[PDB]
Amino acid sequence: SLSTEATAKIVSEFGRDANDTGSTEVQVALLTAQINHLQGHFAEHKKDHHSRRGLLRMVSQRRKLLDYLKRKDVARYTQLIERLGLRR
Amino acid sequence: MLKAGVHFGHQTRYWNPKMKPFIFGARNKVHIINLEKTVPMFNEALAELNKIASRKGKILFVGTKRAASEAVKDAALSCDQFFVNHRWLGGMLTNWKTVRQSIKRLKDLETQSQDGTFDKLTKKEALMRTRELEKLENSLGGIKDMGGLPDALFVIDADHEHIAIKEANNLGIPVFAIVDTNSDPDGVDFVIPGNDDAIRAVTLYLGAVAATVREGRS
Amino acid sequence: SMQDPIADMLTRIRNGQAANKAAVTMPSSKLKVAIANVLKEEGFIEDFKVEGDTKPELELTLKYFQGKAVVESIQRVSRPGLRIYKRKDELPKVMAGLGIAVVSTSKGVMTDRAARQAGLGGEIICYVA
RNA sequence: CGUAAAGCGCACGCAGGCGGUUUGUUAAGUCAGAUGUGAAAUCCCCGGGCUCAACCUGGGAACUGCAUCUGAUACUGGCAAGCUUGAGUCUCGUAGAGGGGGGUAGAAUUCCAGGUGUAGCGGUGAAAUGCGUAGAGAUCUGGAGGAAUACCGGUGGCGAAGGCGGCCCCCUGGACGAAGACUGACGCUCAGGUGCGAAAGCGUGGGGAGCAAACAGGAUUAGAUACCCUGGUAGUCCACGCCGUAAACGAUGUCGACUUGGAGGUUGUGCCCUUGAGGCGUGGCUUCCGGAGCUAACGCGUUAAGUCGACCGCCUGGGGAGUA
C-alpha cells in the first residue's frame, strides 16, 4: 500500500497524537491518501481491473466512515472534508 | 483400585468418541482407560450378574476372538454355564428356532457317534458325518445343552461381537461387555471399560466373572 | 451477523441437549438472564451462573431426566424479521398446557400461565415444549 | 430450490429490511383499563309464539375495528451517554500461476539459403490424394518469424467469479499470522443501479510459425454434405472498443452462531534436552472418509444438504416456450 513514513505523517497530522491510529478522521485520511496515489497509478494501466477492485473497496469504506462521522459529529465532518478537499 | 493388575487400556486406532467418559488417555498415541472408573463399573456388573446368577439363570459367555478361546470354554465350563468361542452364528438368539434343530442334529449325531451305528455301512460317509460333528461341535459347542434362550449375555469384545449385542438388545437380554476404546456402548446394559485383546486381562476378567457366577444360593 | 441473540441462546440449548452436553456457555445479557431465570423456575434447566466482569458469560447447567433430555423442543416465536405481540386472550398454551411459553410483559419476563394469571399480555419470545 | 420446477455468472452499493452491549429519559409500536362509536336485520347462546319444523320474536354475546383518555415499561423504536467480545486502523513479517506494463531465455514446429546424399517420403485398418530424381525424406550449418512456455507440477497455490504456469524489473490489489496500541457498532443483506465477466463472435489497425471452423481433394460407405487421410482460409496472437453468454457447476446466494471424530495437504507461529526421521500447542485455507442429525433415496456430514437467525434471488404439471 502506502509508505511507513507517509502513514506515520498522516497519523501525526490527523490524530489526537501518535498511537491514535484508528480514529475516524485518521482512517479517512489514510484511505484518501491511497485513493489519490492510485489515481496516478490507474490513469496509466487502465485495465488493471483487479487492483481497481481494491480501490473501490477503499472508496466505499471511506464513504461508510464519512457517513458515520457525519451522523456522530458534524463539526468534525465539516473540518475533515474541508481539510481533505473531498466532496467537490 | 487394582483388581485389574496388568492391562491399563489400549487401541490407539479407530477410537470411539462415545468412550470419552472412560479415557485417561496419555501415553505414546495409545489411549489409557481410567481404571478408577472401571472398578465401580465392573463391581456393578458382578453385582447384577450375581443377582441373575442366583435366580438360576443362564449366562452365555461370548469369546470368538483369540485367545478368548479356550478361556471362555474354561471359564464358562468351570461354572455349569454356556459359551460361544468360535464364530458366533448370525441369529442363534433371534432365530433360536432353527438353531434349535441344528443343536438337535448335534445331539442325535453324537448319540449316533460314540454309541450307536458309526461304523455302519460306509467309511466315507462315516468320515463325512464325523466332520459334521466337528463343524456342529465347534460352532454349537457350549450352547448345545442350554435348551432355552439365556437370561443374560456376557461378551468379551463389543465391536468384534456386535452381532450378539445387537440380538440380545433385540430380545431384551442384559448385555455385559468389556468394551475397549474402539468399541461402542450400543445397548450394553452393563458396560465395563477394559481391555478386550490381552489374555492376562481376559483371564483375570473372566476369572472374576466365573468366580461370581458359581455362587447361587448353594 | 448476529441479529437475534435470543434465538442464538435457544440454539445453544437445543444443540447442547442434542449432544448430551453438560453445560452451555454464551455471552450474557439482561434478557438472556431473564429467560434463563424463567427456564430454571419452570424446571427446564438445572442452574445458571453469570460470570465475568467486562464480558459476562451466562452458563446454563442443562437437565437430563432419563437418558432422554428435558428440553424437548425449544422454538423462537417473536423473531426480528416478524415480531409477535399477543393480548391476554390470544396468549397461547403450548402442548395443551404442558410446556410454557415465555412472554415478555410489561411487568417483566414471565410464562404464559403467570402472565395470563397477572391479567396482561405481551411479546411472546419462545415456546418451550 | 445438490439431483424432481427453482440460487442471479460474480461482486460493489443506494433506497429498503434487520441490527452486539450497559445506563438514563421518552412511551411511538406493545400491553391493561375506561369512554364514544362499530345502524337494524343476519351468524352464535339462553328463552318465547305459530300443533312441530321452516318461520317469527325477547334478552344477551358478537361485530375480531377505529378514535380519545388513563396507566405499565419487559421487549422493539426515538433521544442522550457509554462499553468491548462485531467491524475497522496502525506496527512487523510470511506464502502466493492475484492484476497491469516492459524486457529477456531455452527447447521445438514451419519457412529461406547452402553442404552431404539418394530413391523414396508421408499416411492409414488398408489405401489413395499429397510431396519427390527440377533431388524429396534423412542429416549438418547459418538466418527469419510467430505462438506457447516441458521438467518443477502436487484432489498444490492465488483470485469475488471468469480465470491466472519460463525467468527478470517496474507499478499495484488482497489474504494470513505474532504481540501491542487506537476508533468505538462505524455492522449484515440488497430490489432498481453500477462494475467485472471463459470461449466463440463483431469493428478498426497490426501480426500470422503451429493448429484449424469454412472449403477442396482422397478414401470409407448403399449413400457419407461425417468419423479417417492430405491440404487449408477466417479464427486463434497483439492494441483499442463492442458483445454479454456457458454443464459461467461445489448443478449448493450472502453474512453470523452452535453441534461427536479420524487421516492428510498447504501456509503462519509459540513453547519445551534438538540432545531423530524432536516433542507439545495455537491460528488461515484446503482434500478424503465417516458419527448424530437430515434427506424420496442417492448422499451431505464443524467448508452441512444438521440445529437456528437476517436479508436477497427464484419455483408452482409436461409440451407449446424461454418462443411470439
PDB file of C-alpha atoms in Angstrom, chain A:
ATOM      1  CA  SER A   1       0.000   0.000   0.000  1.00  0.00           C
ATOM      2  CA  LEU A   2       1.474   3.243   1.366  1.00  0.00           C
ATOM      3  CA  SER A   3       4.862   4.140   2.832  1.00  0.00           C
ATOM      4  CA  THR A   4       5.519   3.737   6.543  1.00  0.00           C
ATOM      5  CA  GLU A   5       6.762   7.321   6.695  1.00  0.00           C
ATOM      6  CA  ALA A   6       3.634   8.546   4.875  1.00  0.00           C
ATOM      7  CA  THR A   7       1.244   6.666   7.186  1.00  0.00           C
ATOM      8  CA  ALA A   8       3.160   7.957  10.202  1.00  0.00           C
ATOM      9  CA  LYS A   9       2.896  11.512   8.852  1.00  0.00           C
ATOM     10  CA  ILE A  10      -0.864  11.281   8.382  1.00  0.00           C
ATOM     11  CA  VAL A  11      -1.404   9.725  11.796  1.00  0.00           C
ATOM     12  CA  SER A  12       0.643  12.595  13.234  1.00  0.00           C
ATOM     13  CA  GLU A  13      -1.427  15.220  11.364  1.00  0.00           C
ATOM     14  CA  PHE A  14      -4.956  13.941  11.959  1.00  0.00           C
ATOM     15  CA  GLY A  15      -4.852  12.011  15.248  1.00  0.00           C
ATOM     16  CA  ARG A  16      -5.050  13.348  18.777  1.00  0.00           C
ATOM     17  CA  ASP A  17      -1.468  12.096  18.992  1.00  0.00           C
ATOM     18  CA  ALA A  18       0.577   9.240  17.551  1.00  0.00           C
ATOM     19  CA  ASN A  19      -0.821   5.815  18.597  1.00  0.00           C
ATOM     20  CA  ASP A  20      -4.301   7.233  17.946  1.00  0.00           C
ATOM     21  CA  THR A  21      -4.232   5.458  14.633  1.00  0.00           C
ATOM     22  CA  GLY A  22      -7.782   4.113  14.443  1.00  0.00           C
ATOM     23  CA  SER A  23      -9.754   7.295  14.781  1.00  0.00           C
ATOM     24  CA  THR A  24     -12.263   8.047  12.112  1.00  0.00           C
ATOM     25  CA  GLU A  25     -10.505  11.125  10.697  1.00  0.00           C
ATOM     26  CA  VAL A  26      -7.252   9.204  10.545  1.00  0.00           C
ATOM     27  CA  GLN A  27      -8.712   6.233   8.698  1.00  0.00           C
ATOM     28  CA  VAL A  28     -10.450   8.576   6.302  1.00  0.00           C
ATOM     29  CA  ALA A  29      -7.218  10.451   5.622  1.00  0.00           C
ATOM     30  CA  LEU A  30      -5.218   7.262   5.022  1.00  0.00           C
ATOM     31  CA  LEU A  31      -7.828   5.958   2.614  1.00  0.00           C
ATOM     32  CA  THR A  32      -7.781   9.355   0.924  1.00  0.00           C
ATOM     33  CA  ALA A  33      -4.017   9.318   0.528  1.00  0.00           C
ATOM     34  CA  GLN A  34      -4.081   5.925  -1.061  1.00  0.00           C
ATOM     35  CA  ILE A  35      -7.013   6.817  -3.332  1.00  0.00           C
ATOM     36  CA  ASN A  36      -5.137   9.787  -4.742  1.00  0.00           C
ATOM     37  CA  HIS A  37      -1.893   7.881  -5.188  1.00  0.00           C
ATOM     38  CA  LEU A  38      -3.720   5.182  -7.121  1.00  0.00           C
ATOM     39  CA  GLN A  39      -5.439   7.885  -9.240  1.00  0.00           C
ATOM     40  CA  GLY A  40      -1.893   8.269 -10.521  1.00  0.00           C
ATOM     41  CA  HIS A  41      -1.488   4.518 -10.967  1.00  0.00           C
ATOM     42  CA  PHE A  42      -4.831   3.913 -12.779  1.00  0.00           C
ATOM     43  CA  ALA A  43      -4.535   6.903 -15.135  1.00  0.00           C
ATOM     44  CA  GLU A  44      -1.957   4.525 -16.633  1.00  0.00           C
ATOM     45  CA  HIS A  45      -2.724   0.809 -16.995  1.00  0.00           C
ATOM     46  CA  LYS A  46      -6.444   1.287 -17.087  1.00  0.00           C
ATOM     47  CA  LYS A  47      -7.043  -2.451 -17.491  1.00  0.00           C
ATOM     48  CA  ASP A  48      -5.834  -3.450 -14.059  1.00  0.00           C
ATOM     49  CA  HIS A  49      -9.312  -4.481 -13.135  1.00  0.00           C
ATOM     50  CA  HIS A  50      -8.121  -6.395 -10.039  1.00  0.00           C
ATOM     51  CA  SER A  51      -6.302  -3.574  -8.413  1.00  0.00           C
ATOM     52  CA  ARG A  52      -9.288  -1.415  -9.138  1.00  0.00           C
ATOM     53  CA  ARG A  53     -11.470  -3.660  -7.157  1.00  0.00           C
ATOM     54  CA  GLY A  54      -9.158  -2.926  -4.203  1.00  0.00           C
ATOM     55  CA  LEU A  55      -9.519   0.762  -4.995  1.00  0.00           C
ATOM     56  CA  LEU A  56     -13.325   0.645  -4.986  1.00  0.00           C
ATOM     57  CA  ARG A  57     -13.148  -1.077  -1.622  1.00  0.00           C
ATOM     58  CA  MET A  58     -11.171   1.961  -0.428  1.00  0.00           C
ATOM     59  CA  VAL A  59     -13.704   4.373  -1.863  1.00  0.00           C
ATOM     60  CA  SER A  60     -16.652   2.527  -0.355  1.00  0.00           C
ATOM     61  CA  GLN A  61     -15.017   2.168   3.018  1.00  0.00           C
ATOM     62  CA  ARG A  62     -14.163   5.900   3.098  1.00  0.00           C
ATOM     63  CA  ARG A  63     -17.763   6.582   2.309  1.00  0.00           C
ATOM     64  CA  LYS A  64     -19.030   4.475   5.166  1.00  0.00           C
ATOM     65  CA  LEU A  65     -16.747   6.236   7.595  1.00  0.00           C
ATOM     66  CA  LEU A  66     -17.775   9.680   6.398  1.00  0.00           C
ATOM     67  CA  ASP A  67     -21.399   8.676   6.894  1.00  0.00           C
ATOM     68  CA  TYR A  68     -20.627   7.529  10.446  1.00  0.00           C
ATOM     69  CA  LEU A  69     -18.738  10.653  11.343  1.00  0.00           C
ATOM     70  CA  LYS A  70     -21.415  12.763   9.710  1.00  0.00           C
ATOM     71  CA  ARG A  71     -24.108  11.306  11.963  1.00  0.00           C
ATOM     72  CA  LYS A  72     -21.926  11.459  15.067  1.00  0.00           C
ATOM     73  CA  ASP A  73     -20.276  14.888  14.993  1.00  0.00           C
ATOM     74  CA  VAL A  74     -20.970  17.210  12.071  1.00  0.00           C
ATOM     75  CA  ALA A  75     -18.304  19.752  13.090  1.00  0.00           C
ATOM     76  CA  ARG A  76     -15.620  17.068  12.755  1.00  0.00           C
ATOM     77  CA  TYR A  77     -17.207  16.207   9.393  1.00  0.00           C
ATOM     78  CA  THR A  78     -17.016  19.724   8.030  1.00  0.00           C
ATOM     79  CA  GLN A  79     -13.472  20.295   9.334  1.00  0.00           C
ATOM     80  CA  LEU A  80     -12.448  16.914   7.901  1.00  0.00           C
ATOM     81  CA  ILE A  81     -13.826  17.174   4.367  1.00  0.00           C
ATOM     82  CA  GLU A  82     -12.771  20.829   4.405  1.00  0.00           C
ATOM     83  CA  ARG A  83      -9.172  19.784   5.107  1.00  0.00           C
ATOM     84  CA  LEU A  84      -9.029  16.808   2.699  1.00  0.00           C
ATOM     85  CA  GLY A  85     -10.580  18.682  -0.226  1.00  0.00           C
ATOM     86  CA  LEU A  86     -13.070  15.952  -0.941  1.00  0.00           C
ATOM     87  CA  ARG A  87     -16.878  16.231  -1.525  1.00  0.00           C
ATOM     88  CA  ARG A  88     -16.040  18.515  -4.546  1.00  0.00           C
TER      89      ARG A  88
END
